[PDB]
Amino acid sequence: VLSEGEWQLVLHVWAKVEADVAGHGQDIWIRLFKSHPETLEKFDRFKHLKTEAEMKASEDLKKHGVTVLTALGAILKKKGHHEAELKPLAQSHATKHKIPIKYLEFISEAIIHVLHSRHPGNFGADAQGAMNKALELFRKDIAAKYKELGYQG
Amino acid sequence: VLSEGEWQLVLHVWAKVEADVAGHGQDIWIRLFKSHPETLEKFDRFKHLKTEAEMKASEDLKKHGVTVLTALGAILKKKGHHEAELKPLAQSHATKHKIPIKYLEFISEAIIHVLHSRHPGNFGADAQGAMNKALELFRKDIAAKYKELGYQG
Amino acid sequence: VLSEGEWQLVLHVWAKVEADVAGHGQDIWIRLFKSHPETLEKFDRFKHLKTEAEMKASEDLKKHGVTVLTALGAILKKKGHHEAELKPLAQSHATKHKIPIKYLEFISEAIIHVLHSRHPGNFGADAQGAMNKALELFRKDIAAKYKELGYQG
Amino acid sequence: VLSEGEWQLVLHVWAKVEADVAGHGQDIWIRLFKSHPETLEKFDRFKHLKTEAEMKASEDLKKHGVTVLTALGAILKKKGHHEAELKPLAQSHATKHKIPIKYLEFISEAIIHVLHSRHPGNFGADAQGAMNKALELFRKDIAAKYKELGYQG
Amino acid sequence: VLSEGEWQLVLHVWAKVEADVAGHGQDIWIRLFKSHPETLEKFDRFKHLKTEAEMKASEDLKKHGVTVLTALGAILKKKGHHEAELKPLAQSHATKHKIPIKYLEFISEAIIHVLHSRHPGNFGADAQGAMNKALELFRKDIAAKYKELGYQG
Amino acid sequence: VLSEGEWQLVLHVWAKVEADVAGHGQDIWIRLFKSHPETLEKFDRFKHLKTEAEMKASEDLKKHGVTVLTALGAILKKKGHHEAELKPLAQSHATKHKIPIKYLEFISEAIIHVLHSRHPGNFGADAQGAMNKALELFRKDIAAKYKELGYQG
Ligand code: HEM
Ligand code: HEM
Ligand code: HEM
Ligand code: HEM
Ligand code: HEM
Ligand code: HEM
């Protein structure tokens, strides 16, 4: 459980992200696919992208990034009371996309790296500590649902 | 032990399956053999089938699917009081067919995937949770019999 | 410890076996050597047999099967009070033949398969459960003697 | 927790190091890169250096050594009350440089070897014991931050 | 600890062995070297022997067998009170010959096999049980000394 | 902790060693390097020695053996109260020579073998037991210092 103080550090940096959700989505994507190329194989819609240039130019990948960050933002804004938001996401990612927990760890790593680069003034050690805690909370509850749905993860 | 509420979610989606048992049987089969080809080797009657086309055309495989789902349906409708129904099934599958528990897990996975595809309105996160729980109950009791009969599983 | 009820299920099917001990001995043998060929290597008297045809024709192998089943029958009829019968068998099999417990498991598996094939009316799930329990009792006590005699098994 | 006596042994030898921070920085560097060449790969600014001669001649590597030892000195002088000093160092080394704990162990080993060579009169068994304890304290608290920041280390 | 009854079974069969110590020594030797050829490598005095024929003909190997069995007999006759007899044997075998416990297990196995072959009337299941227990007692106390002397065994 | 009786057995045989420290040093050396050639690699001053003949002829290796045994003798004569003597030895062997505990075990083995060969009348089972205990005490306390100094060993 996160403290109100920790939630504030998270929502304060997220308000900066919201100033340009599409741009933030792109940076996270490229970071993820360059650091862990195997994840790209899960996207039959984007697996043909070869270079960073191609990724940056994909209008579809950009739109998907916005969809992703918007869903995550709705979750964070619930400050732990995200049961309703997690159910449909756990179902699709476990049953249709088949995304293991290890990959959620990788994208969490990408989110932190991008926030650290673009928002150093609002992403100091304590702020990163809180964001990490929030994402670990997310993964802990998703992995829980995964088990209930019958997917090891 | 499942709650009455959980059983209801299971029987509600199963009533949809019963509207076309043969068609549901076929989809589960193809899904199983494509996802885990090694299972096909256990069926000396169907191991010669090479493609999805051939499987879809096999009148015998279709009939067997109905026999399978009918037996499973009788079990689910007992809501946990399935001792009598499990004995003969555990004996044949342990002693004659020699089907390991790992393969029952694979077919459970196939059942969930097919229900999720054909009945999204009646197979939400909670419904899938209940169905998974019912199938895990099935496997837990079968594995138990397996041990009693002298088969590791 | 087996219940009187369990012993009855065992002795009831064994009375059928006794109607043709020699034939039952042969079926068990062929089943064992085909399923686990390595066991044949322990019999310097039968290791030259190449096919199922040759095995079925061996008058010596047939006679040995009768000797084996007769010894086992005497044990089962003691309903757990088989200490005297086990000593000489554990000594020869541990010290002279050098038969590991793993091989006693294999022949137990062969006995069950043959009874299941030839006597389905008297070898239902409960009956098989009892027979398995009786054979596991046998192996448990033999393995115990093995240790006392200085053979790991 | 270190005793006041142990801290004194540490600060007494460190006062000698401060008489020539740049020279001490160089010796530690060369010792580290020769003993564990893989660490050099983390420095994109120095990874091109091939020999000890080149390292000794690099004006940039010399300047960096001073920056490093100065930061470490500030930490040691806090005698355990180094929370504020550790936060920014853990953030950069975990998130940007990605330096595993194993590498902090290697540089700790290099520091001890150099002090042992240049200051034997002030680096006896007890003194080395205290310095080791101080560096293990450093690593223990850094590894702790690493976890909070989301880096395994 | 062995019972007086168990000791009697051991000494009763040993009195038969004493009727021909040299012959018993030879049988044990050949059995050991044929079953576990690696043990022969420890005897620089006998490692040149190639066949069973050569072993049976070696006058020196025969004499050594008598020396061995005589020492073992003196131990068994002490019925557990063999501390004085074990010290010099543990010292030479641990420090000079370097004989691991695994090899004492192998020769124990050879002793049992030979007694079983030559004295079936006095080496039934109970008798073998007692002899095994006596030899395990021997090995347990020797391994203990080994540790005290500084040899792992 | 060793008893006064055990210390006496150790010091009694050591008084014999002192009658020819140089000769004893040489025998231990050759035994060590022949049994465990890898240890020679630690001595940059002696690693060029190829044969036993060369070792026996090295005046420097002979002198070093005396230095070694003299230091060990001073330790043993302290009968457990060797804290002051161990500190400088642990520092050099951990930090400069980098000698793992495994190698101290090897030289302990060499010491015992040589005493057993040259002094059988004063190195019986009990005497060897005491000497082993004294050397294990030595290694236990050295390994302890190693940890304090920051060397795993
Ligand atoms: C921060 C974590 C994540 C969030 C909040 C998230 C969110 C979403 C959302 C809202 C959708 C659209 C609706 C749906 O299908 O449920 C989606 C689709 C998808 N997600 Fe995720 N996702 C996350 C991580 C991942 C990761 C790490 C992978 C793969 C390595 C993944 C693979 C997919 C795929 C394959 C789709 C379908 C895309 C398409 O074909 O249109 N997701 N995700
Ligand atoms: C949902 C789980 C399952 C149910 C309810 C089920 C049910 C049945 C039923 C009722 C029969 C006919 C009667 C009998 O032989 O007992 C049967 C036959 C058989 N089952 Fe299953 N089964 C299940 C899973 C499997 C799996 C996963 C395998 C193999 C990977 C398997 C292999 C067989 C075989 C080989 C036969 C014989 C088919 C033939 O040759 O005619 N079963 N099963
Ligand atoms: C149900 C378990 C078994 C029973 C009741 C049994 C019984 C017997 C009996 C009564 C004999 C003759 C007397 C004797 O030597 O003790 C015998 C001989 C023998 N048994 Fe078994 N046995 C069993 C399992 C096995 C197994 C699994 C193996 C090998 C894989 C084995 C290998 C032998 C051998 C090699 C002989 C000697 C045959 C010859 O050369 O004449 N037995 N057994
Ligand atoms: C005694 C432990 C260490 C201390 C006190 C220390 C201190 C520092 C300081 C103060 C900086 C500059 C500011 C910053 O980036 O945070 C720095 C930069 C850096 N450190 Fe460390 N560091 C330590 C160990 C290491 C080790 C062992 C590695 C790698 C094996 C490492 C890799 C780096 C890198 C790559 C930089 C950036 C250099 C550049 O490109 O300019 N550090 N470190
Ligand atoms: C029942 C167990 C054993 C007993 C009672 C025993 C007894 C003896 C005795 C009394 C001696 C002569 C005096 C001495 O050196 O201590 C001896 C010598 C020896 N033993 Fe054993 N021993 C046993 C097992 C073994 C085993 C299993 C090995 C090797 C695999 C072994 C290897 C040797 C060697 C190499 C010698 C020296 C022979 C020579 O070169 O003359 N012993 N043993
Ligand atoms: C009974 C255990 C040992 C004792 C009492 C001992 C004692 C000594 C002493 C007193 C010195 C000289 C002063 C010093 O450098 O501390 C020394 C030097 C040294 N020792 Fe040991 N030592 C022991 C075991 C070993 C072992 C097993 C190794 C290596 C396998 C080793 C490697 C060295 C080396 C390399 C030197 C330096 C020699 C030179 O280059 O002059 N020592 N030792």
- Rg of chain A taking only CA atoms, in angstroms: 15
> What is the C-alpha to C-alpha distance for residues E101 and E82, in angstroms, rounded to an integer?
18
> What is the C-alpha to C-alpha distance for residues E35 and E19, in angstroms, rounded to an integer?
26
- Residue written as tokens 């690593």? D139
Q: B150 and C112: CB-CB below 8 Å?
A: yes
Is any ligand 3 atom within 6 A of the Cβ of residue C79?
Answer: no
Cα four-point dihedral sign C48, C53, C57, C60: positive
CB F145 within 8 A of CB F90: yes
The neighbour count for residue A140, using CB atoms within 10 Å, is: 10
CA distances to A95, B128, F133 from B111, in Å? 11, 11, 67
* Domains, in order of start, for chain D: 1-153 (1.10.490.10)
CA distances to D69, D94, D131, E77, F64 from D110, in Å? 12, 21, 12, 64, 29
Chains A, B: CB pairs < 8 Å = 30
Cα four-point dihedral sign F31, F36, F39, F45: positive
> What is the C-alpha to C-alpha distance for residues A145 and C77, in angstroms, rounded to an integer?
54
F120 touches chain E (CB under 8 A): no
Which residues, at least 6 apart from D132, have a Cβ–Cβ distance to it below 8 Å?
D108, D112, F148, F149, F150
DSSP state letter for D3 = -
| Binding-site residues, ligand 4, Cβ < 6 A | D 39, 42-43, 45, 67-68, 71-72, 89, 92-93, 97, 99, 103-104, 107
What own/partner pairs with CB < 8 Å and gap ≥ 24 does F12-15 have? F12/F122, F12/F127, F13/F115, F13/F119, F13/F122, F13/F123, F13/F127, F13/F131, F14/F73, F14/F76
Instruction: Name all chains with 3 or more CB-CB pairs below 8 Å to chain A.
Output: B, D
Q: Indicate which residue's Cα is closest to atom 24 of ligand 5.
A: E104
Q: In this complex, which of B113, B133, B135 lies closest to A95 when CB atoms are compared?
A: B113
CB E16 within 8 A of CB E121: no
A90 touches chain B (CB under 8 A): yes
Maximal CA-CA distance, chain D = 43
In a 3-state reduction of DSSP, which class is residue F123? coil
Cα four-point dihedral sign F68, E149, F106, F54: positive
F87 to chain D: which residues are within 8 Å by CB? Answer: 124-126
The neighbour count for residue E51, using CB atoms within 10 Å, is: 10
Chains C, E: CB pairs < 8 Å = 30
Question: What is the chain D residue with the closest CA to F91?
Answer: D125
Cα–Cα–Cα angle for E60, E65, E67, nearest 5°?
95
Q: Indicate which residue's Cα is closest to atom 23 of ligand 1.
A: A68
Amino acid at F109: E
Query: CA of F90 to nearest chain D CA: how many angstroms apart?
Result: 8
Q: How would you label E101-136 residue by residue, b for 16+ Cβ within 10 Å and e otherwise?
A: bebbebbbbbbbbbbbebbeeebbbebbbbbbbbbe
Cα four-point dihedral sign C99, C103, C107, C108: positive
Q: How far is the CA of B93 from the centre of ligand 2 (A)?
A: 7
List the one residue out of D9, D27, D33 whose CA is nearest residue D69. Answer: D27
Q: At what angle do helices E101-118 and E125-149 cross, to 10 degrees?
A: 160
> What is the C-alpha to C-alpha distance for residues A127 and A8, in angstroms, rounded to an integer?
9
Read off the tokens for A79: 């400050």
CB A126 within 8 A of CB D88: no
Maximal CA-CA distance, chain F = 43
> What is the C-alpha to C-alpha distance for residues E95 and E93, in angstroms, rounded to an integer?
6
> What is the C-alpha to C-alpha distance for residues A59 and A36, in angstroms, rounded to an integer?
21
- The CB-side HSE value for B102 (13 A sphere, CA atoms) comes to 7
CB C108 within 8 A of CB B150: yes
Is any ligand 3 atom within 6 A of the Cβ of residue C142?
Answer: no
Query: CA of F46 to nearest chain E CA: how many angstroms apart?
Result: 28
CA distances to C122, C124, F55 from C118, in Å? 9, 12, 80
- Start-to-end CA distance of chain D, whole Å, equals 23
Amino acid at C45: R
Amino acid at A74: A
| Binding-site residues, ligand 1, Cβ < 6 A | A 39, 42-43, 45, 67-68, 71-72, 89, 92-93, 97, 99, 103-104, 107
> What is the C-alpha to C-alpha distance for residues F152 and F98, in angstroms, rounded to an integer?
10
Q: Where are the beta strands (DSSP E) in chain A?
A: none
> What is the C-alpha to C-alpha distance for residues A144 and A94, in angstroms, rounded to an integer?
11
If you count them, how many residues does chain C have?
A: 153
List the one residue out of B44, B83, B95 whose CA is nearest residue C119. Answer: B95
F128 touches chain E (CB under 8 A): yes
Q: Closest ligand to E41 CA?
A: 5
Rounding to the nearest 10 degrees, give the CA dihedral for residues C106, C111, C113, C114. Answer: 140
Read off the tokens for E151: 């040899």
DSSP A112-133: HHHHHHH-GGG--HHHHHHHHH
Query: CA of C130 to nearest chain E CA: how many angstroms apart?
Result: 29
Which residues, at least 6 apart from B151, have a Cβ–Cβ distance to it below 8 Å?
B94, B95, B98
Read off the tokens for E102: 């695994």
Resolution in A: 1.7
CA distances to A131, D15, D70, E66 from D64, in Å? 31, 20, 10, 78
The neighbour count for residue D12, using CB atoms within 10 Å, is: 14
Q: Indicate which residue's Cα is closest to atom 8 of ligand 4.
A: D68
> What is the C-alpha to C-alpha distance for residues B17 and B112, in angstroms, rounded to an integer?
12
DSSP chain E: ---HHHHHHHHHHHHHHGGGHHHHHHHHHHHHHHH-GGGGGG-TTTTT--SHHHHHH-HHHHHHHHHHHHHHHHHHTTTT--HHHHHHHHHHHHHTS---HHHHHHHHHHHHHHHHHH-GGG--HHHHHHHHHHHHHHHHHHHHHHHHHT---
A92 touches chain B (CB under 8 A): no
Contact flag for F and A (3+ C-beta pairs < 8 Å) = no
CB D81 within 8 A of CB F119: no
> What is the C-alpha to C-alpha distance for residues E64 and E22, in angstroms, rounded to an integer?
9
Q: How deeply is F143 buried, as exposed, middle or buried, from its count of CB atoms within 10 A (0-12, 13-18, 19+)? A: middle
Maximal CA-CA distance, chain A = 43
D116 to chain F: which residues are within 8 Å by CB? Answer: 91, 95-96
Read off the tokens for F46: 């002696």
F149 touches chain D (CB under 8 A): yes
> What is the C-alpha to C-alpha distance for residues C134 and C2, in angstroms, rounded to an integer?
7
- Residue written as tokens 């449909």? A88
Phi-psi region of B98 (alpha: psi -120 to 50; beta: other; left: phi over 0): left
- Residue written as tokens 């975990």? D94
Atom of ligand 5 nearest to the CA of E44: 40
Question: What is the chain D residue with the closest CA to A123?
Answer: D91
Phi-psi region of A150 (alpha: psi -120 to 50; beta: other; left: phi over 0): left
Question: What is the chain C residue with the closest CA to B96?
Answer: C113
Query: CA of D102 to nearest chain F CA: how many angstroms apart?
Result: 14
Question: Given ligand 3 and candidates C34, C93, C111, which is best to mutate, with the most ligand atoms within 8 Å of its CB?
Answer: C93
CB F137 within 8 A of CB F104: no
> What is the C-alpha to C-alpha distance for residues C131 and F130, in angstroms, rounded to an integer?
59
A136 touches chain D (CB under 8 A): yes
Read off the tokens for B133: 């729980």
Q: At what angle do helices E101-118 and E21-35 cross, to 10 degrees?
A: 120
**Phi, psi (deg, nearest 5) at residue E78:** -85, -10
Q: Closest ligand to F73 CA?
A: 6
C149 to chain E: which residues are within 8 Å by CB? Answer: 125, 128-129, 132
Question: Given ligand 2 and candidates B29, B59, B75, B92, which is best to mutate, with the most ligand atoms within 8 Å of its CB?
Answer: B92
Is any ligand 2 atom within 6 A of the Cβ of residue B92?
Answer: yes
Read off the tokens for F10: 């150790």
Cα–Cα–Cα angle for E25, E29, E31, nearest 5°?
120
Read off the tokens for E4: 């007086």
Read off the tokens for E52: 């069973």
Q: How would you label F80-113 residue by residue, b for 16+ Cβ within 10 Å and e otherwise?
A: eebeebbbebbbebbbeeebbbebbebbbbbbbb
Q: Which of B102, B128, B138 to mutate to test the interface with A (most CBs of A within 10 A)?
A: B128
> What is the C-alpha to C-alpha distance for residues B127 and B121, in angstroms, rounded to an integer?
10
**Phi, psi (deg, nearest 5) at residue C98:** 60, 60
A87 to chain B: which residues are within 8 Å by CB? Answer: 124-126
E142 touches chain F (CB under 8 A): no
Amino acid at B108: S
> What is the C-alpha to C-alpha distance for residues A14 and A122, in angstroms, rounded to an integer?
10
DSSP F33-65: HHH-GGGGGG-TTTTT--SHHHHHH-HHHHHHH
- Rg of chain C taking only CA atoms, in angstroms: 15
CB A15 within 8 A of CB A122: no
CB A95 within 8 A of CB B116: yes
DSSP D101-130: HHHHHHHHHHHHHHHHHH-GGG--HHHHHH
> What is the C-alpha to C-alpha distance for residues A130 and A9, in angstroms, rounded to an integer?
7
> What is the C-alpha to C-alpha distance for residues D134 and F7, in angstroms, rounded to an integer?
38
> What is the C-alpha to C-alpha distance for residues A94 and A87, in angstroms, rounded to an integer?
11
- Rg of chain B taking only CA atoms, in angstroms: 15
> What is the C-alpha to C-alpha distance for residues E80 and E86, in angstroms, rounded to an integer?
11
> What is the C-alpha to C-alpha distance for residues D80 and D130, in angstroms, rounded to an integer?
13
Q: How far is the CA of E132 from the centre of ligand 3 (A)?
A: 23
Q: How would you label B65-85 residue by residue, b for 16+ Cβ within 10 Å and e otherwise?
A: beeebeebbebbeebeebeeb
> What is the C-alpha to C-alpha distance for residues E10 and E80, in angstroms, rounded to an integer?
12
Q: Closest ligand to B103 CA?
A: 2
* Positions of chain breaks in chain E, given as the residue before each break (C to N > 2.5 Å): none
Atom of ligand 2 nearest to the CA of B88: 16
The neighbour count for residue D51, using CB atoms within 10 Å, is: 10
> What is the C-alpha to C-alpha distance for residues B77 and B73, in angstroms, rounded to an integer?
6
Phi-psi region of A79 (alpha: psi -120 to 50; beta: other; left: phi over 0): left
Q: Which of F86, F148, F151 to mutate to test the interface with D (most CBs of D within 10 A)?
A: F148
Q: At what angle do helices E125-149 and E59-76 cross, to 10 degrees?
A: 90
List the one residue out of A70, A80, A63 whose CA is nearest residue A26. Answer: A63
> What is the C-alpha to C-alpha distance for residues F54 and F48, in angstroms, rounded to an integer?
9
CB D92 within 8 A of CB D67: no
- Residue written as tokens 């024709």? C57
> What is the C-alpha to C-alpha distance for residues C80 and B7, in angstroms, rounded to an integer?
44
Q: Which of B95, B146, B151 to mutate to test the interface with C (most CBs of C within 10 A)?
A: B95
- The CB-side HSE value for D74 (13 A sphere, CA atoms) comes to 10
CB B144 within 8 A of CB B24: no
SS (H, E, C) chain B: CCCHHHHHHHHHHHHHHHHHHHHHHHHHHHHHHHHCHHHHHHCCCCCCCCCHHHHHHCHHHHHHHHHHHHHHHHHHCCCCCCHHHHHHHHHHHHHCCCCCHHHHHHHHHHHHHHHHHHCHHHCCHHHHHHHHHHHHHHHHHHHHHHHHHCCCC
CB F146 within 8 A of CB F101: yes
**Phi, psi (deg, nearest 5) at residue A146:** -50, -50
> What is the C-alpha to C-alpha distance for residues F122 and F124, in angstroms, rounded to an integer?
6
> What is the C-alpha to C-alpha distance for residues D48 and D41, in angstroms, rounded to an integer?
9
> What is the C-alpha to C-alpha distance for residues C61 and C23, in angstroms, rounded to an integer?
11
> What is the C-alpha to C-alpha distance for residues B96 and A140, in angstroms, rounded to an integer?
42
